[PDB]
Amino acid sequence: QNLKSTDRAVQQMLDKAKREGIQTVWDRYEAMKPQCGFGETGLCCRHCLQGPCRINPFGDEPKVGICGATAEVIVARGLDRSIAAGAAGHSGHAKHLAHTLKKAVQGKAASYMIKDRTKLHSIAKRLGIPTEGQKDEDIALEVAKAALADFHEKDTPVLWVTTVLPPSRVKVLSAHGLIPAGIDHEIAEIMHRTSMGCDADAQNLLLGGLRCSLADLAGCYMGTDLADILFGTPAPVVTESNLGVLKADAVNVAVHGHNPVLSDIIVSVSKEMENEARAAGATGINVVGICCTGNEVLMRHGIPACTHSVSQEMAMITGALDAMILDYQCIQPSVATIAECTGTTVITTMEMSKITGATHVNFAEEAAVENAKQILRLAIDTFKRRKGKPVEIPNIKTKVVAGFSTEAIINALSKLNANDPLKPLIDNVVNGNIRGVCLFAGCNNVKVPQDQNFTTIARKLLKQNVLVVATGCGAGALMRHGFMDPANVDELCGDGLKAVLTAIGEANGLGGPLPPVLHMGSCVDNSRAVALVAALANRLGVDLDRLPVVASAAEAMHEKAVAIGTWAVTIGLPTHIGVLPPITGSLPVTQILTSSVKDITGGYFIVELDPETAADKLLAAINERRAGLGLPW
Amino acid sequence: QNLKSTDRAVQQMLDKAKREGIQTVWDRYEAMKPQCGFGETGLCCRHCLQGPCRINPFGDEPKVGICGATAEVIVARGLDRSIAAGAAGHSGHAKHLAHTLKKAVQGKAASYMIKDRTKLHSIAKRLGIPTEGQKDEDIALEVAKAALADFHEKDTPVLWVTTVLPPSRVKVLSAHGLIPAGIDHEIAEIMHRTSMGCDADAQNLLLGGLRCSLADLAGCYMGTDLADILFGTPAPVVTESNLGVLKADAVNVAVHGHNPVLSDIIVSVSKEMENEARAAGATGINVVGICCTGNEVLMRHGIPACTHSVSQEMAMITGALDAMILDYQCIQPSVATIAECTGTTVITTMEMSKITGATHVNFAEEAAVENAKQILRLAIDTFKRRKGKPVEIPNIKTKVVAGFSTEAIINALSKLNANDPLKPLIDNVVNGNIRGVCLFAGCNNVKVPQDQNFTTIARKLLKQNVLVVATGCGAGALMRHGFMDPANVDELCGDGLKAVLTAIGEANGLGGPLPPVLHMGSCVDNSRAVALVAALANRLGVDLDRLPVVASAAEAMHEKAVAIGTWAVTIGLPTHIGVLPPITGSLPVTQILTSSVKDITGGYFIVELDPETAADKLLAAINERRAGLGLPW
Ligand code: SF4
Ligand code: SF4
Numbered sequence A, B: 001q002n003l004k005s006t007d008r009a010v011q012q013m014l015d016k017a018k019r020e021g022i023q024t025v026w027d028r029y030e031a032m033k034p035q036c037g038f039g040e041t042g043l044c045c046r047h048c049l050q051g052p053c054r055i056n057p058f059g060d061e062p063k064v065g066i067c068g069a070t071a072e073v074i075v076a077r078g079l080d081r082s083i084a085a086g087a088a089g090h091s092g093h094a095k096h097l098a099h100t101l102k103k104a105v106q107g108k109a110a111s112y113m114i115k116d117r118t119k120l121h122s123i124a125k126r127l128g129i130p131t132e133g134q135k136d137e138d139i140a141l142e143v144a145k146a147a148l149a150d151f152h153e154k155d156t157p158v159l160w161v162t163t164v165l166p167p168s169r170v171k172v173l174s175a176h177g178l179i180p181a182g183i184d185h186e187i188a189e190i191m192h193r194t195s196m197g198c199d200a201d202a203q204n205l206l207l208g209g210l211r212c213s214l215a216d217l218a219g220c221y222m223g224t225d226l227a228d229i230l231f232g233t234p235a236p237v238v239t240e241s242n243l244g245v246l247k248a249d250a251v252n253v254a255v256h257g258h259n260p261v262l263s264d265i266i267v268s269v270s271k272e273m274e275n276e277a278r279a280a281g282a283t284g285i286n287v288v289g290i291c292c293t294g295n296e297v298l299m300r301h302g303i304p305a306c307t308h309s310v311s312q313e314m315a316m317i318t319g320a321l322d323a324m325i326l327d328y329q330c331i332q333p334s335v336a337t338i339a340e341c342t343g344t345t346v347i348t349t350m351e352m353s354k355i356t357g358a359t360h361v362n363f364a365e366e367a368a369v370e371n372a373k374q375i376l377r378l379a380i381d382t383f384k385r386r387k388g389k390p391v392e393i394p395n396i397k398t399k400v401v402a403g404f405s406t407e408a409i410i411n412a413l414s415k416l417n418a419n420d421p422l423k424p425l426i427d428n429v430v431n432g433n434i435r436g437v438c439l440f441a442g443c444n445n446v447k448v449p450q451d452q453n454f455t456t457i458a459r460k461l462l463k464q465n466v467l468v469v470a471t472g473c474g475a476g477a478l479m480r481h482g483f484m485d486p487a488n489v490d491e492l493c494g495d496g497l498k499a500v501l502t503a504i505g506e507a508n509g510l511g512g513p514l515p516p517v518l519h520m521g522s523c524v525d526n527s528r529a530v531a532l533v534a535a536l537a538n539r540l541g542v543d544l545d546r547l548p549v550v551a552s553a554a555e556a557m558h559e560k561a562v563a564i565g566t567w568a569v570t571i572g573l574p575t576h577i578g579v580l581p582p583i584t585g586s587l588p589v590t591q592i593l594t595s596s597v598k599d600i601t602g603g604y605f606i607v608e609l610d611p612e613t614a615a616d617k618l619l620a621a622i623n624e625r626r627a628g629l630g631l632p633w
């Protein structure tokens, strides 16, 4: 089972599923082999009904699409629709939060409120919305208004791009026409330009894709900003991760999907319902997180993380998961089928994301506390029905220190330098105690043994003194393998990095270091990494493409991860991807994305499936930047 | 060559291309056979990097997507992205026109103006924009404002849906949550819901697709409205079609693509440049149309139509096409490669639609007359370079009467009844002289011998007294085979229909009938058909799904045609498609789109690849509606 997952709790559940004849994501992958080579290389097009068209990677005909579309056009068009789809998901998320903030300050949804007043005012100030003399509810109205207005064309470009990147970066992107006009505007224009008989120049196509990736960044940043206003900016917290956080004698409820609008409320109400749960024979309600909405409540409330991404079905296989509460994105629809076997109540809550066979409970922000009790009451009923059944919760978990928003990282550093909090970080970059910064982001992928690329690359970078930060299921992978436990700093970290992590943790009075990897939050919270890196660029007076900062989507899966990787490249970072994206069928497109895009944005993709080799390449990219700043490396 | 195209001019050029070794769309189709069966049935998914996933239509594994996505989810998600892509193209078109109207009345683009004042005021009135006491430029500002606002969420739904359908239809659609909130909003929500681990219920998915098809209708209607304001509402015109409208001794310039913003200007300036052309040795500038922008200038200016859709390359093979001026959509990118062989100058003009190897000339509405002269001067240079070369223009053309906007049809009918212009049409429906109405729309497709389904079905309906109207390349197909020449009414039309066409043409004082098929314009001008049908519903006091009106996308190709077919079904029409859409891999999805959707919208798809059989089915659908209104049939 070690070939399927490096997670020991997951291996245990794989044996249980095998015993019980429950089919998993790894079984459905095996049954799909060998996979279509035209699709894996990107050489397939179904954009019109004359299709499908395919192109042999090598050999004889077919060599060209029926309408004349070349390999490089087919490959670029497919990549562009992937980016637009990713943009649409982060965008839908952010829009949901904007409507929620508006409803809240309109007296239309009392379960919600302005919790982070300081964040509200600073966002307002960055957007140019006057706060002086204004009611909080009115400033929030204006901020929600601004969020909604960035989805479409208007007199300004998308402000959740132009106001969050340093002016030098914005000017570089404007010079190539890459600043988005509107988030949903860019998505539609991509779908237009990639439809039949439209855009048919690889460079032109890919420039459109860079601009749409910045629409995805906007949606990520907007999501983070709005969730922080509504639910609070994260600060350091300690909790646990992996299947052992389930408790046989509790009502176990997974929150799964993406939007905290839902899960934050589940968390607060579940506390209101402890006695009801106790009456039904449970110790209480055990809320646990899966995928990004689980990261959101881990970051803000210390809710333990159960599992992530590719292994999400295994939480159900324990037999102890009473409910799985979903909103949207990255939920394997297999869970609805598996539920019949495992007794789990799968509940969908959003009108645009249903799963045949799951129970659907409309979630209205207006009725949030009421709807959440209805949902938790299904959970308690389910708990009562497994009275007497044996469960198999692997007794396996790790300790997780998390909650490192950019504000929290700045505050932590401020203990070493109150008026110039970034300076201590930059001092150690310069003296070599910190070689550079690597962001791990994105998914697990069934083609890669689960977490093997994230932990292999992270180990080699940490030994090399790289400051490692993580989000989404990259954070999931590293938390489940101990990388967020400060007790593993001695084992994992090079001396220089250890020194810095220890110097900062001591100064935050905890007699021990920060953890080996800093968990910066959900995948929209990749925007936090951007804020940090942009703050560093600004403090240094250089652009981002001169900083010794890289990203790694080491086991990428979702269209969203493709969108994130592309905007990492667009804002100037060397960006590793550890799964093959469908571009290998076109050497010209590959060459653009791994090399000449350096001349446009200064970032570039690093395609490398071998994790030790990837680590080497990421170190070389870091050290090259070090060299360009005139530092030793 | 009769197996490739039923057009004799196209057959002649196919022989020339074969002789000269120039590869065509039919050669690239042959080279693609046999085509992938997973893609043709819809059983393939590439929405994440764990893919590609496929599902055997029959047999053993694989039976399910790696994430658990079932055949019916994969099929519905693919269909939904097709609809969104179609919506995005009609939407981009309409947006282009809205910005153009705004620029114009802002003094920012003098080449453009309000030409149809009456249309401006009636649109303003239907939108609720006050006109009383207001300057035309201010009303136009407000109308452009309203157009732009329908792309996004706001206090009202999309008004180019809710104000163009009768209230009873809007209430039916609202009851199922099908009214779009915003055009680009719906496109992005589709891309979101169809991304991995999101919407996974076929019924839910397809309801989203119906709503996004109404966003496509909005964009079509908005495009028609805005192009009519700027360039004039069409009125009856006489011209010609097919390759014989090219003239060896003229500068032959094709306008190709979709937006009249461009082609209308090419038309007017080309007249300014006749002497320049005469100086270079040409008789003058011969502007001819291809695909929908060619329909637009045919409808408004009587510009002859050269060719359409699948056979567009053949205009170049004549050796006489000096320039092909493009904006976006449905242009085979092969034209850039073919140009090197044929001497044609291919010119792109829109930043989001370039073709490697073509010359690009930025077109700015602000500089429209200047840019258009630069472009025509490339044309004249090209003409001069084929001095002495032999050309092969097939001496083959048809006469085309066209320009039947809904306003023109109402005016024509008004000659038989001034204050109740629709009544004479309805009288003849009732007495049986008109069996019902069929709209032919959409593309040619290389899998079908060109035009064979459109003319076979049209012949059998016309004999049965059906009033046939047509748009886009369905209009192209029928015009090129004589169906828009009033001299063929005796041959083609049943006696009842002949009677009516003759009664109306005589009353419009022309001593002869209207043509056998009424050309209602480009594919956005399918909205004109909607206005007519809605006016008929309103005059009858019934909804559209009680009218004896059907649609046929008999040789569909583009995502746009899929979008149009789906909104035809959504507003209540029996809607034929004559090519297989990728839904056959899922019987539940097929059953929804061909049968239970009747219970939701009253319309339904009719999938039939055999044209005689299709005609039978369309007649049965018409006669069933006749029966439901209590009429004989
Ligand atoms: S767009 Fe071109 S390459 Fe794609 S399916 Fe249609 S004919 Fe084939
Ligand atoms: S979304 Fe599901 S069915 Fe589609 S490629 Fe990914 S794993 Fe396969």
Ligand code: FES
Residues within 6 Å of the ligand: A036, A037, A038, A039, A040, A044, A045, A052, A054, B036, B039, B044, B046, B052
């Ligand atoms: S030919 Fe397999 S993905 Fe299309």
Ligand code: FES
Residues within 6 Å of the ligand: A036, A039, A044, A046, A052, B036, B037, B038, B039, B040, B044, B045, B052, B054
């Ligand atoms: S397997 Fe051929 S279209 Fe994907």
